[PDB]
Amino acid sequence: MTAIANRYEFVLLFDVENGNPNGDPDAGNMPRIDPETGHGLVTDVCLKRKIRNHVALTKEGAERFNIYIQEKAILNETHERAYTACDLKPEPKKLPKKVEDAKRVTDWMCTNFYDIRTFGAVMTTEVNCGQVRGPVQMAFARSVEPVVPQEVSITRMAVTTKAEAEDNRTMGRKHIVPYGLYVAHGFISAPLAEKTGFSDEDLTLFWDALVNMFEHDRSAARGLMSSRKLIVFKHQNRLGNAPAHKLFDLVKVSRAEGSSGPARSFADYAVTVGQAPEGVEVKEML
Amino acid sequence: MTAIANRYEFVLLFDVENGNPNGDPDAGNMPRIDPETGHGLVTDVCLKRKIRNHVALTKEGAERFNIYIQEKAILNETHERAYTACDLKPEPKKLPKKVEDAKRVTDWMCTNFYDIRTFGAVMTTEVNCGQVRGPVQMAFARSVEPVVPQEVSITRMAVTTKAEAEDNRTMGRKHIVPYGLYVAHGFISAPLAEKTGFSDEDLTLFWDALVNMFEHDRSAARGLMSSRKLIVFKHQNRLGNAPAHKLFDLVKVSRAEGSSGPARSFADYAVTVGQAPEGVEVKEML
Amino acid sequence: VSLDPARTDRPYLLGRLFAVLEKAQEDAVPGANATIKDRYLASASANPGQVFHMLLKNASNHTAKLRKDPERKAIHYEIMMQEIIDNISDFPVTMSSDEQGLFMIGYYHQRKALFTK
Amino acid sequence: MILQALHGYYQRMSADPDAGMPPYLCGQCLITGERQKPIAQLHPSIKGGRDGVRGAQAVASIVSFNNTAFESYGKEQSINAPVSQEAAFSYVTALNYLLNPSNRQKVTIADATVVFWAERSSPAEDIFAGMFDPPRMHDLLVAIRSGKRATDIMPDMDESVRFHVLGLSPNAARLSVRFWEVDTVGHMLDKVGRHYRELEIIPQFNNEQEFPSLSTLLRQTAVLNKTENISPVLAGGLRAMLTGGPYPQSLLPAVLGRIRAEHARPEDKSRYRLEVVTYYRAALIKAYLIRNRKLEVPVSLDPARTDRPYLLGRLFAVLEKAQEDAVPGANATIKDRYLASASANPGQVFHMLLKNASNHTAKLRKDPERKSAIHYEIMMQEIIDNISDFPVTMSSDEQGLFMIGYYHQRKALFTKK
């Protein structure tokens, strides 16, 4: 398996306009915020979902490019596919007792499903396929400046079953972030890519997905979101030769000369990338 | 391989941003905290595990650098190797009566298992191999300021088994510390190194592991963790020239005067290192 | 009564202000599907500096609506807000955890006072 | 006394033609005080295992000097404890007779096995087995708890007969006397009544007994609610039962730590998510607070209390109820995670709990149950009205009051609506 041979870090900048980048399941649907500073948050799972959707859209289920999580799929049924492909009988909760067989099923999952190969998966269930840690990781995306989510009252001129009145007849609700610039950090691990087989074409598809995540995510509640900058740090060796935090600090985001009032466009910020260390190459043309 | 000749203390400062540095099995999976004061905790075993993982990754199982506590190892089976190598046969729960043979088996365990040589081990199982204290010790890491662990709710668009749940999506939740700076103390005992053979090569590898401990520990739950400062106090002779607590007090961590509100970056803190006693030198440059 | 109008702790005063604004809103728009507490409690405590001005615009609109008819108290709430803000020199950028606890205590104290006959 | 009391018990039982057995250098016997008697080099063994001291070797003993460190003044073996051979045999036989489970004078408490008897024949001997481990017994127990004389339920009992209790613990074939009590039957029934009066609490579920067993109470402090992992010292100290003295000071921190380390366990297949502050833990906390701290603790919720720890416990209970209503079938609740820190450091966490509860009630106010949403808000408003500030820290006693308040308020909300 010709996995990638270098370690990577990257920084992704994306913003939203009058939209809900990621709703909070247990706070109604308000956009996630830092509960002590007001900075907006977008979970890593949201961005990974968008990448999965982009891969599914652009590859259309081609060989070696299926999506494991899919949508309303039953995961145990997919585990049984791996077990049958290897000519093995799944035990009630346990991996095959032979280590080579145990690795064969997990290798089948990794080689068939792109998102297992990329982000890993937990497959310990009634049909156990083991666990994969995932060469690619992303941290929570955090807004550059505090956001002020606003609830927007919406009315509907139709009723569902039978109106209480039979004056208004419905009062909906929308949540929007008037504007926010988010910064997402991520890592790619060559040692784990060697375990899963995450290769160079996979990495190219991943860069493409990051660049084009939001172009096909349009919806009523999403608003306008787009990717603005993508800084990629490519280490010269397998284990890397610079701390990740040092590289992330080379990307400076500051309010531009148009610092008057709240920010409402990407032009209100200035982004600068410093010089990379000796053994690290920074490619920013993305 | 000659053992080290000097006593060492060291202080490690490491961060976490939107991550779970160490989950608590009792409090669901929340980050460990001191419930009386709210300060975060990271167990010593947690850090030792990361050092073990770094050693395994960087040495790739090279000779004299194996890890005794591995992910899928069965300890008694490893014990059998020592007896086979030394040509003894194990008594049912006891070491060989010939004390020289017991020392030989224990040394074989120490001579080629790096983590046994470093952190010690308890091997008094059915295949008894003895005990080792290990020169290197670590204390619980404790956050400089109380941490506010916020709880994040997430959903999965797929179901595992055959269920009619999805009416709402499948629910799950992460726990993250918005930010926290942790201080970990540690000790290296030359008298114990002389017993286990912990050499200067091992010490250099250990410093390297501490510096690069988190750079290959990325995952979906960890967030962004990094080593910020490693201050090493080297004593002039085999036994210390000063108390450990006196040395640890030289490293003072306080919040930068220009910072306010909750801490969200390492720049919110200022770290000062004082003058060491006459018999000790600080290798703060690590 | 358990409310302390002479305390003058900024988190406590902000909690009282939040309670009075909630009362004004609920009086101006009865039957609303959600109180201003549900809408803005998270943002209010997380980032008080940038949202209390919005809450005050909304409360001004609510008081203006109240003032139009004999159901007008509007003078009462306006006086309460003017009094509470009189003791505040500046809105906090952020509040500590115990500061937010005091905020909630003040809000709940003020809310009960406005429920009195 | 102890060994002399077993000797006297042998004398008493050996006289009877049934329910017993008659079988039979020089020095002074320490059991009887008789001078110039044949001292015993080695005492007859005492049974271990099922018919003896649980956890001990089959041939355990009380007197043994198998190692030199245990020998004094140049004496060898059991010569260090000079006792006449007949007295040694008598006391060993009495202890073995009591250790036989066929005789109804034996009970096991965690690590130790307890054997009891009276100086004369008395119905208390068969009665006390139920006092230490409740299953007509219920009437006696309820009378005793109220303080009435046991004669009121059965005048046959002479309360002046003195009663002996012996607690033994196992080792590598040698036993240790963990505790030893002697008192009149009347007096020690009064102390058990005091104990049960202190423990009294409204039951959480109707299947829980009104006189919790000592083993059941102790098991609820163990690591995983199992007989092992019960601290032997805590079990031995909780002697406090039948001596009337203060409970060991480690009891309250043990219970609080157990609450801290516990969480709902549906894995037991109990369709009700198991409580962390159970009936037994709350009973223990109440007993400790009444005895050691001399506080006033009600058996049921007291809405006129106005103690800040108690009010905070009630507030926590109502917040948890709001969470449960807003999120049916939730795997975890604040009970599992924030109960410890809220009690130990209220000023640090209650803001987050209140904001979460605001989110929970906001959902209810929209969904059906559109006003238990308002009821919970009213409860929170009323409780918080008596609080001036959230304390930065609370002592162990204040945390115990917090737990009691949470338990009382939680029970009041099971079927309020």
- Report the distance separating Cα D26 and Cα A269, nearest Å: 103
Contact D344 B148 (CB under 8 A): no
C-beta neighbour count of A44 within 10 angstroms:
22
- Report the distance separating Cα B44 and Cα B138, nearest Å: 6
Maximum CA pair distance of chain A? 74
Contact D385 C97 (CB under 8 A): no
- Report the distance separating Cα B271 and Cα B229, nearest Å: 9
**Distance from B28 to chain D by nearest Cα, in Å?**
7
Which residues from chain C sit within 8 angstroms of residue D389, using beta carbons? 101-102, 105
Which residues from chain C sit within 8 angstroms of residue A27, using beta carbons? 42
Alpha carbon of residue C112 to chain centroid: 12
Contact C93 B148 (CB under 8 A): no
- Report the distance separating Cα D54 and Cα A211, nearest Å: 71
- Report the distance separating Cα D126 and Cα D143, nearest Å: 18
CA distances from B40 to A17, B280, D23 (A): 37, 31, 68
B164 contact partners, CB below 8 Å, separation of at least 6:
none
Which residues from chain C sit within 8 angstroms of residue A148, using beta carbons? 43, 47, 50-51, 54
Task: Give the residue carrying structure tokens 């609490």.
Answer: D201
Which residues from chain C sit within 8 angstroms of residue A171, using beta carbons? 33
- Interface B–D counts its CB contacts (< 8 A) at 31
- What are φ and ψ of residue B248, in 5° steps? -60, -30
**Distance from C30 to chain A by nearest Cα, in Å?**
14
- Report the distance separating Cα C7 and Cα C12, nearest Å: 8
- For A28, which of D327, D356, D362 is closest by C-beta distance? D362
Token pair for A207: 């860069």
Q: Decide if A24 touches B, using CB distance below 8 A.
A: yes
Contact D349 B33 (CB under 8 A): no
Contact A27 D352 (CB under 8 A): no
- Report the distance separating Cα B109 and Cα B88, nearest Å: 14
Contact D355 A35 (CB under 8 A): yes
Half-sphere exposure of A50 (CA within 13 A, CB side): 26
- Report the distance separating Cα D392 and Cα A139, nearest Å: 33
Cross-strand partners of B280: B235
- Residues 336-375 of chain D with CB under 8 A from chain C are 346-352, 354-355, 358-359, 361-362, 365-366
Nearest CA in chain B to A28: B153
Of the residues D348, D359, D360, the best mutation for testing chain B's interface (the one with the most B CB atoms within 10 Å of its CB) is: D348
- Report the distance separating Cα B23 and Cα B29, nearest Å: 5
Alpha carbon of residue B155 to chain centroid: 33
Q: Decide if B261 touches C, using CB distance below 8 A.
A: yes
Q: Decide if D355 touches A, using CB distance below 8 A.
A: yes
- Report the distance separating Cα B20 and Cα B223, nearest Å: 7
Alpha carbon of residue A252 to chain centroid: 22
Token pair for B36: 């009386």
Contact between A3 and A117 (Cβ < 8 Å): no
Task: Give the residue carrying structure tokens 């001990």.
Answer: D56
**What single DSSP character describes residue D68?**
G
CA distances from A217 to A50, A212, A229, B170 (A): 7, 10, 18, 21
Contact between A280 and A233 (Cβ < 8 Å): yes
Which residues from chain C sit within 8 angstroms of residue D381, using beta carbons? 108, 111-112, 115
Neighbours of chain C (3+ CB pairs under 8 A): A, B, D
Nearest CA in chain C to A170: C33
A121 contact partners, CB below 8 Å, separation of at least 6:
A68, A109, A113, A115, A131, A132, A134
Contact D263 B28 (CB under 8 A): yes
What is the β-pairing status of strands A8-19 and A171-188?
Answer: antiparallel
Of the residues B39, B151, B175, the best mutation for testing chain D's interface (the one with the most D CB atoms within 10 Å of its CB) is: B151
- For C94, which of A30, A36, A148 is closest by C-beta distance? A36
> Residue D118's closest CA among D104, D102, D138, D133?
D104
Which residues from chain D sit within 8 angstroms of residue C97, using beta carbons? 347-349, 351-352
- Residues 113-142 of chain A with CB under 8 A from chain B are 119-120, 125-126, 133-134, 137, 139-140, 142
Q: Rounded to a whole number, what is the distance in angstroms from the first to the last CA of chain D?
A: 59
- For B262, which of A37, A49, A133 is closest by C-beta distance? A37
Which residues from chain B sit within 8 angstroms of residue D260, using beta carbons? 26, 35
Contact B26 D263 (CB under 8 A): yes
Token pair for D367: 């969904």
- Residues 222-261 of chain D with CB under 8 A from chain B are 260-261
What is the β-pairing status of strands A150-155 and A171-188?
Answer: antiparallel
Contact D352 B148 (CB under 8 A): yes
C-beta neighbour count of C93 within 10 angstroms:
14
Approach to solving: cryo-EM
Which residues from chain C sit within 8 angstroms of residue D354, using beta carbons? 101, 104
- For C38, which of D350, D362, D382 is closest by C-beta distance? D362
- Report the distance separating Cα A269 and Cα A256, nearest Å: 5
Contact B260 C97 (CB under 8 A): no
Which residues from chain C sit within 8 angstroms of residue B146, using beta carbons? 97
Task: Give the residue carrying structure tokens 């949470």.
Answer: D406
Q: Decide if D359 touches B, using CB distance below 8 A.
A: no
Angle between the N-to-C axes of helices C48-67 and C10-28, in degrees from 0 to 180, rounded to the nearest 10: 40
**Distance from B30 to chain C by nearest Cα, in Å?**
18
Contact C101 D351 (CB under 8 A): yes
- For C93, which of B146, B148, B261 is closest by C-beta distance? B261
- Report the distance separating Cα D8 and Cα A3, nearest Å: 85
Contact C94 B261 (CB under 8 A): yes
A141-170: b (≥16 Cβ within 10 Å) or e: bbbbbbbbbbbeeeeeeeeeeeeeeeeeee
- Residues 210-269 of chain B with CB under 8 A from chain A are 212, 215-216, 218-220, 223-224, 226-227, 261-262, 264, 266
Q: CB burial class (10 A; 0-12, 13-18, 19+) of residue D235? A: buried
Of the residues C37, C50, C58, C95, the best mutation for testing chain A's interface (the one with the most A CB atoms within 10 Å of its CB) is: C50
Contact D350 C34 (CB under 8 A): no
C-beta neighbour count of B8 within 10 angstroms:
23
Contact between B8 and B234 (Cβ < 8 Å): yes
Token pair for D108: 């096991």
Contact D359 A35 (CB under 8 A): no
- Interface A–B counts its CB contacts (< 8 A) at 92
Token pair for A197: 């087989």
A197 contact partners, CB below 8 Å, separation of at least 6:
A1, A2, A3, A110, A111, A117
D324 contact partners, CB below 8 Å, separation of at least 6:
D330, D333
- What are φ and ψ of residue D175, in 5° steps? -100, 155
Torsion sign (Cα): D407, D411, D416, D417: positive
CA angle in degrees (0–180, nearest 5) for B238-B240-B242: 165
